[PDB]
Design a protein around this ligand. Sequence first.
Ligand SMILES: Nc1nc2c(ncn2[C@@H]2O[C@H](COP(=O)(O)OP(=O)(O)OP(=O)(O)O)[C@@H](O)[C@H]2O)c(=O)[nH]1
Ligand SMILES: *C(=O)[C@H](CCSC)NC=O
Ligand SMILES: [K+]
Ligand SMILES: [K+]
Ligand SMILES: [K+]
Ligand SMILES: [K+]
Ligand SMILES: [K+]
Ligand SMILES: [K+]
Ligand SMILES: [K+]
Ligand SMILES: [Mg+2]
Ligand SMILES: [Mg+2]
Ligand SMILES: [Mg+2]
Ligand SMILES: [Mg+2]
Ligand SMILES: [Mg+2]
Ligand SMILES: [Mg+2]
Ligand SMILES: [Mg+2]
Ligand SMILES: [Mg+2]
Ligand SMILES: [Mg+2]
Ligand SMILES: [Mg+2]
Ligand SMILES: [Mg+2]
Ligand SMILES: [Mg+2]
Ligand SMILES: [Mg+2]
Ligand SMILES: [Mg+2]
Ligand SMILES: [Mg+2]
Ligand SMILES: [Mg+2]
Ligand SMILES: [Mg+2]
Ligand SMILES: [Mg+2]
Lengths: 394, 127, 108
Amino acid sequence: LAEATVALAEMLELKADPNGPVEGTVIESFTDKGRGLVTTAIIQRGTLRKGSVLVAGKCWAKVRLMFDENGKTIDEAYPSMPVGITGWRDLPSAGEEILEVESEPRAREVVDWRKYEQEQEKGQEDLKIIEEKRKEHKEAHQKAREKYGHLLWKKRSILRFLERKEQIPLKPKEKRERDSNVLSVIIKGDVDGSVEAILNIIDTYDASHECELELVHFGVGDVSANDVNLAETFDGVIYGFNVNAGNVIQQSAAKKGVKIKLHKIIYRLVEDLQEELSSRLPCAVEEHPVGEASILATFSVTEGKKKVPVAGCRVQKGQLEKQKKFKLTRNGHVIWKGSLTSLKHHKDDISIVKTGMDCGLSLDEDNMEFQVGDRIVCYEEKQIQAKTSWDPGF
Amino acid sequence: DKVRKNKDAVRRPQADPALLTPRSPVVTIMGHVDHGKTTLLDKFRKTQVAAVETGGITQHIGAFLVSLPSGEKITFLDTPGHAAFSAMRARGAQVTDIVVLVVAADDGVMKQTVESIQHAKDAQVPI
Amino acid sequence: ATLNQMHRLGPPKRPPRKLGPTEGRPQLKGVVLCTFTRKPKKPNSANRKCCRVRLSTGREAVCFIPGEGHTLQEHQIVLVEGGRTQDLPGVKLTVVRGKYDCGHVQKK
RNA sequence: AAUAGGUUUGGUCCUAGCCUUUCUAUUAGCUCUUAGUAAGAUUACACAUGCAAGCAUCCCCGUUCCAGUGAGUUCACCCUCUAAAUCACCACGAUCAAAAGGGACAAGCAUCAAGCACGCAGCAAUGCAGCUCAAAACGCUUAGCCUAGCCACACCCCCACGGGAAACAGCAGUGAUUAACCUUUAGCAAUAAACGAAAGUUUAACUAAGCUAUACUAACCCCAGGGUUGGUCAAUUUCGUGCCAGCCACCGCGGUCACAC
Ligand SMILES: Nc1nc2c(ncn2[C@@H]2O[C@H](COP(=O)(O)OP(=O)(O)OP(=O)(O)O)[C@@H](O)[C@H]2O)c(=O)[nH]1
Ligand SMILES: *C(=O)[C@H](CCSC)NC=O
Ligand SMILES: [K+]
Ligand SMILES: [K+]
Ligand SMILES: [K+]
Ligand SMILES: [K+]
Ligand SMILES: [K+]
Ligand SMILES: [K+]
Ligand SMILES: [K+]
Ligand SMILES: [Mg+2]
Ligand SMILES: [Mg+2]
Ligand SMILES: [Mg+2]
Ligand SMILES: [Mg+2]
Ligand SMILES: [Mg+2]
Ligand SMILES: [Mg+2]
Ligand SMILES: [Mg+2]
Ligand SMILES: [Mg+2]
Ligand SMILES: [Mg+2]
Ligand SMILES: [Mg+2]
Ligand SMILES: [Mg+2]
Ligand SMILES: [Mg+2]
Ligand SMILES: [Mg+2]
Ligand SMILES: [Mg+2]
Ligand SMILES: [Mg+2]
Ligand SMILES: [Mg+2]
Ligand SMILES: [Mg+2]
Ligand SMILES: [Mg+2]
């Protein structure tokens, strides 16, 4: 395999100019506490040396240190060489091309022109959204104005005063309560590529109806006070991926009630993400039929000066229990859902009537009409832990 | 014409034939989970990193400048095989010159082996 | 007052100048929480775009977005500054256009 | 608050507050040609790496200096006395200067009003019952200051046997954090310091460079932008909108003729 790889490379006839402004690509980008913002990159054209000014997307740098996989400083990075680069004034995205520029003011000029272009593209997108909000409002305004003619505004407020005397609106609280089924997550990762992987997994969420997943903030590096403050602000959960949280940060989270969930494996961090979503979900009640009894005769009993309709029923299959909930069935239709007010058999109250036992049934709802042939199906309701429908593909 | 002047830095035009000097190849080890990508890389790196991992899963893309016994130097990009790291595999295929597809004989082609092949076709890199 | 009374008291003590919502600071960084509207007090009538943001100090105040139209959503980062909005009582903070997520008002 | 101005009312006068015009320093937005000079983390939070104290015929000396920061905070000033130190040395006196003694010395709150042993005499034993304070005692909070500079700190527990525990508040640089963001240069050639009898050696002190509209000075054939335009307050054509959208430091504008958007 080593021979085959060498043979094919020679057939490819790979060649790159080793002089001139350096070109490259970022393979990884991460934050080091001592060395700062560091990007692992591969050179593609030119030779990189200390003091080279580099631009990569919206981040520029002046090469401060060049190191290899083992950390030993390298003086030059010829084409097709792996090289960690320090000196970045902002963290480049992974996969971003690297270009060398004449000077730092030129680098800042190049970055200022890339940021502006990004702001114009966002501005054009925002314009369509704003034009939609502003078109809807202008219709509601023209409609309410044209409700009356183009009369003197004093009259329109007076004519509206007639319909303002009929108006009583309620103002909704400016700050509204986040619903229980809403999971806010802060994603912190060791490297930028690891964070993008978790963010693509959070973009495969399709169960928004049952519960909503909100991404408050994402970043690279260890958990920080801002992450704890952002989690406390939105009642979110911090998920760390190959990152650490110090005692000061962990203690602050305890006081603020934030939950830091440091992981080291991506299938572990997704399983835990699904466990928190499941908790938010509503408890799925499980209805188990307990018994069934058909009504026969309807009686009107006078107790306490109140006429109580009593449904005489014969238990056919199963048994009926006072605690277990009931429902009324009419020729297949479901008429009622509730619990009996009084279960009384042969002038004696019996909690559990067995199969074939006669029992008079009175409901708490007086509007329920009892016929000769109605059916009643008793059932037991048990809440069951509901698991998130969202599957991440692994 | 009150529009911001273009001040972007663009890639230099393709190098002249005279300037072009031979360079080392960039290779990427692509494949499916637990098909031996890291173990194969370790034998040529002459260092064992598979045991020194959390779960024995590669979750990062690392470029190592290996020096072959003949005296050639090759750069190995060890890509992750898990389904989550689809973006890492595409980025590796865009900076590589050759793709070493590790298809385990016992299991054969898998979901991520086809994905690795697709990334190579888009990048148009010999496999 | 007499000279003896002026000697006992002493130089007038200027009340400690009170701080505003910016805590005596030019600007502040905050996270957007909500995006509502408020009505001016008589005699002005309009719906003014405002937003409740939590500042870096820890407090949670109401800010006013100037300009025609905006696309500010929950979790975004905005730079606030001082300046009371005369129509709106209790609104003392203004969002800085062209900084962080908030963008300049598109022309026309 | 000034050579003042604007704004209470149906209207006048008086009083009074808010604001405006002036000058700086941060930061933000949009914008930016050069040259020379000065200045240059938000944070007493945490720090990868490298350098920062040597000299010298062995002892000694020095590294207790410079450099840094601003947590804390009436040790900084004068007088008295008097060590160490320099003047090669004994001696002399001068100079410099600590400790000790006396005096002086920030701001706010009195809704901090009483403190609680804070005094005297006497050789001593011991005796007496005092001492401070509404001319602010005691106390709480805040803050480096009175700038040829000084004081204070030197990871924390005032201290540093001891313990926690494993220290850039040295230069450069980083992470976090903040509205706040300087190079991981060179050289000891000048000055200063240290050592040496000395030639001399050393020094991230310093010097000379680098980055940056923070500021000043000067200039430029080409190359100008920013904010204003109802009044205060210098200065608007025509459309569009129609109490909507939006605007203003203050008074205020906009309801189909808008010098205010
Ligand atoms: N028997 C046998 N086991 C092998 C061989 N190659 C690899 N393995 C085993 O396969 C397992 C996975 O090896 P890894 O090197 O982690 O494989 P990978 O494809 O790089 O894994 P990911 O990075 O998670 O995609 C380990 O337990 C290896 O010992 C082989 O040729 N024979
Ligand atoms: C009432 O007493 C009940 C009525 C049954 S009608 C078939 N019977 C026994 O309790
Ligand atoms: K594995
Ligand atoms: K009005
Ligand atoms: K101080
Ligand atoms: K101390
Ligand atoms: K010298
Ligand atoms: K010596
Ligand atoms: K008009
Ligand atoms: Mg692997
Ligand atoms: Mg006003
Ligand atoms: Mg009037
Ligand atoms: Mg007045
Ligand atoms: Mg000093
Ligand atoms: Mg003496
Ligand atoms: Mg003294
Ligand atoms: Mg009180
Ligand atoms: Mg202080
Ligand atoms: Mg100490
Ligand atoms: Mg320190
Ligand atoms: Mg430093
Ligand atoms: Mg930093
Ligand atoms: Mg600055
Ligand atoms: Mg040197
Ligand atoms: Mg300089
Ligand atoms: Mg500016
Ligand atoms: Mg106008």
